[PDB]
Symmetry: C2
Subunit: 628 residues, 2 copies
């Protein structure tokens, strides 16, 4: 029932699933369902083989399959409607610039383009591109340097589209086009009034980054008429934003932007490209709803909505079907990487039968003991709801009273334990079928859950979980077959209390606590963080000087073999000290001296520069210590 | 009135202020009020001298003065009460590890310590420390390697305190203490029940990072009794969190934690250190209230509350006054650095007298024009509230109607402009004294504000403004003397619409728009972001591959001279491409080849590797282009 309460089947998209052994297995390519891998086994294997603690396992095969899937979805819709236009995805580097992603996509069989949101990204795109004539599209604020490079990429051979997202831009691109003597290939991004909040305006106090207002789109078409270059403007672009929860928001977005296609044609411009610009959401929770981190529409539904919109739009006015482009970055990168780490220590409560308090102790403590004895004796069993309220209030009195200076620490420590024992007892008697026992059964699972510490940095590995309440499915890599025997809250090894997971997946909705299988506190399992593929890897900050986690690319062939090559090095203490300008080399020698004036033997004096230098050039994270 | 609506006088703490010239000047050391600097002039100076665009100006003199101020505040209270204990601040590297901060503090006259929240930070602390016996305190999750290093620092000479924040830790420190044969100097961090939410428990599902439960504190004292080392435990620690808005939360925090001091003494332990652990807030808004980004208590008030608590606590039970330690990181670093950048472009609306629509145009447009003509003619002037509602609804009809395909883009562009003209007109007639004209005067300032684009990355320079709605005072470096002539919303050059400032300082409260002085849109002023000192610099992420901004240390002597030495290099496109594994060198040559097959002259073919290599090893940000 635990694989059902985690919704693995739903957000897993057939890539992840619990094998016939309780362990979570992964099938990087669901086209060959027999090519699976015991993720838990693979971890243990690499673990005992010398693998670094917090690791990032990536299955580039998923990137490719995912890409092939959306293309298939748009194909399943192009034919079903009768659309005569082509369709290809244009991955926006923004969501992940990592070589692995850019490459896995390029080196696939499906046709795709690359979008750059800045001059720096354009550079990286041109890099990955190579001598292969690839399609590139440039967005973001543009200046001379950027417009130039863009134009230089066009003259280079590459079919690069320069999206006009600000009137003042068209002036520059044109001038620089003559200076470099190159025929500009550019597109336009129009503001939409569909959202509904003054997003249509181009100068309003509304926080709408780019886009051309209705009047400015006409001025662009007019300016291109003067320089006789309407043939240049050939791409239409609009972005509704990332993670579009509600499908209607999208329909209302293409419906409108689609009229810009026809209205622009009536003015003469051609435009063979209709760029719906990403927006396609990814179900993170696993309930497939209209919530925050979840979409209420499937892959096909999205495709249909898109094609049909531009479709009927053309038919009506008798126009040719343009090439449909999309920039669903998050959509493809989403679940191709899993963060995996270990439990470095746990805080399980210790149930101990309480002993009568000092005969001459405060009444508050006598009261708590009076209630305890009353539980253990044939009286009333439903009166437990009351006994609870009793212990809670007495504990509160001695607590507030402790600060007042009218209760000893020994007394407070005593009361606290009796109360924790009171819970452990009431939690047993509790009846799950009784309506008055359910609001408490949930209250106790909280005040009785384990507090485990995972070997990672939330700010480094899942920053989106900080800036936004980004929900990421977190679960143990094994024992997913049995029923939850206890709850637990998990927090990272950051000294900041803000480093922990707030909400967890729990079937119907999200709970403040995470359900865990019966595990040995002396030897806990590994933890897996999924859907942590987009906007994550290269966007974390070194909180307590914790650097990049190590990453590995895992492959699974129909053959049955499994390749696992290194993908990322992983920062070391030394790397971090370089950032804050310290230089490890000069720091080593400074230690070499202080240790000579140790006045201690040469035996120990040297095994210290070993310990020091070891940790100096060693991983940034912690080592598993037996303090669970 | 603009220097009053920005509250500069309040959050400026005499460091920042508008000089007798409209420009914002800075006095890094208010002990010498005649040592000021025209910040706007300094920027322009360095600007025309070749300084990089987005720059970070830091006045290390402020760090020192700030430190001297809090020490003075605690001194003003130690005597006033009659406290016989010493007091010194212990700066937690966590809030800023940058050499400049660590150094400026160390190289000051005031006594201070350093706190490390991880093994990596401990390394950096030991580094900055040097051969100068300094006080160090270790926090955060600890493992062998970390505990060792800590102990090795004690044997080294440094007085390093190892804070016990988890029962399982005391086992290790003890064992490693014998292995390294060193007498351990450690402190303990106890959980408090003051907060009120089960934070007192050590294993609850509550997200409380570290701390020892009442029972565990007794077990620690007991374990140290067996190994006969109660003399080792000599530091008491508690952390209420960062930015404590309400002063009462603090009083209630020391009051309780103070009893742990006395209760622990009764058991025999000594404890000469009372660490209240940071928490001291900084007023960011400038209203000095109990809001989110603002405290309701001054420097002295905090000091008093602290000393008095531990004070009376001792007197009562007849105990000696312990050394009072605090870790107010944010408190000292807060305002010693200002982010400064330029406006790369603005979006001001263009008022143009509308022309009658096509005689055979839809009624909706006829309706908008009908209302326009009615405004320009001796009829009713208070009926403007109505005319507004009229234009709004007609514009909405043609808008929704445009998507329906029953309105041409020419018509939509027309209506939009007539409406924008309608506003510009109604905004003039509007009466500020009329009660029914104020709810609109605010509605128009929004839909008529300038949209300017600042040359920076919110995610790189002020990440805290993303993960939390961190308010930072943003204002122009000049023209602060005059009255706001227009409002404006400012957004960064990130292609993501989430890159902008949501709220701005506006006297009483925060507004969604920022008030700007009458400026030339062709030649705008510089912008300054203040209070951006803690948790900022080294904690931003390269969103669109935008690297670290450049930083400079500015000095101002009583002499009148101003020194401005370089502090940080500032990433270049090349640096960024290294991160995503690309290597610029091998990328240069790949271009060298594609340009040889350009089939174009050698004149242009070479001025391209110039342009390319220039931007490749050039700053990461954009260049000021005349598109404002």
């Amino acid at each position: 029932k635990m694989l059902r309460t985690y919704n693995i089947a739903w957000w897993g998209n057939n890539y992840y699933d619990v094998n016939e052994l309780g362990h979570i297995s992964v099938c990087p390519d669901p086209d060959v369902p027999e090519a699976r891998v015991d993720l838990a086994q693979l971890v243990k294997t690499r673990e005992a083989q010398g693998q670094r603690l917090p690791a990032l396992f990536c299955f580039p095969q998923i990137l490719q399959h995912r890409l092939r899937s959306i293309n298939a979805a748009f194909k399943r819709a192009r034919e079903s409607y009768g659309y005569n236009g082509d369709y290809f995805l244009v991955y926006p580097i923004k969501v992940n610039q990592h070589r692995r992603v850019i490459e896995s996509l390029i080196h696939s069989g499906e046709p795709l383009g690359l979008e750059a949101g800045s001059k720096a990204e354009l550079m990286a795109v041109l890099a990955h591109a190579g001598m292969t004539r690839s399609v590139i599209v440039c967005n973001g604020y543009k200046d001379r340097e950027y417009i130039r490079l863009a134009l230089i990429g066009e003259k280079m051979g590459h079919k690069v589209y320069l999206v006009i997202e600000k009137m003042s831009e068209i002036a520059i691109v044109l001038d620089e086009a003559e200076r470099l003597n190159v025929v500009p290939r550019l597109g336009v991004r129009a503001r939409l009034a569909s959202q509904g909040s003054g997003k249509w305006q181009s100068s309003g106090g509304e926080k709408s980054k780019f886009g051309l207002a209705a009047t400015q789109v006409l001025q662009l078409v007019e300016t291109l008429r003067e320089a006789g270059r309407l043939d240049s403007l050939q791409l239409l672009h609009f972005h509704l934003g990332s993670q579009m929860a509600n499908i209607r928001d999208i329909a209302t977005g293409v419906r409108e932007s689609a009229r810009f296609y026809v209205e622009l044609h009536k003015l003469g411009v051609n435009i063979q490209c209709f760029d719906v610009g990403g927006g396609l959401g990814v179900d993170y929770e696993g309930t497939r709803s209209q919530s925050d981190c979840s979409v209420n529409y499937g892959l096909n539904e999205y495709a249909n909505n898109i094609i049909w919109a531009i479709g009927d739009a053309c038919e009506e006015n008798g126009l040719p079907h343009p090439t449909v482009i999309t920039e669903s970055g998050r959509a493809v990168t989403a679940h191709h990487t899993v963060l995996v780490s270990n439990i470095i220590g746990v805080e399980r409560n210790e149930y101990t039968v309480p002993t009568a308090p000092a005969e001459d102790a405060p009444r508050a403590l006598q009261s708590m003991w009076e209630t305890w004895q009353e539980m253990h004796e044939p009286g009333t069993r439903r009166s437990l709801r009351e006994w609870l309220h009793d212990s809670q209030m007495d504990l509160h009195d001695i607590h507030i009273g402790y600060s007042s200076g009218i209760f000893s620490l020994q007394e407070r420590a005593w009361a606290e334990q009796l109360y924790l024992s009171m819970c452990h007892e009431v939690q047993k008697q509790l009846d799950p079928q009784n309506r008055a026992h359910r609001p408490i059964i949930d209250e106790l699972q909280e005040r009785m859950a384990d507090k485990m510490y995972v070997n990672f940095s939330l700010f480094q590995s899942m920053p989106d979980a900080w800036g936004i309440d980004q929900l990421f499915p977190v679960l143990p890599l094994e024992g997913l077959d049995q029923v939850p025997e206890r709850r637990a809250v998990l927090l990272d090894i950051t000294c900041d209390s803000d480093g922990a997971i707030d909400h967890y997946i729990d079937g119907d909705g999200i709970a403040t606590t995470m359900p865990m299988p019966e595990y040995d506190p002396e030897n806990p399992p590994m933890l897996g963080f999924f859907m942590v593929g987009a906007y994550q890897e290269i966007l974390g900050n070194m909180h307590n000087l914790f650097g990049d986690t190590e990453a590995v690319d895992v492959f699974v062939f129909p053959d049955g073999s499994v390749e696992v090559e290194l993908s990322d090095e992983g920062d070391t203490v030394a790397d971090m000290l370089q950032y804050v300008q310290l230089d490890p080399k000069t720091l080593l020698t400074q230690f070499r001296d202080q240790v000579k004036k140790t006045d201690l033997d040469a035996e120990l004096q040297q095994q210290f520069l070993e310990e020091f230098e070891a940790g100096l050039y060693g991983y940034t994270y912690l080592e598993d210590e037996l303090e669970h």
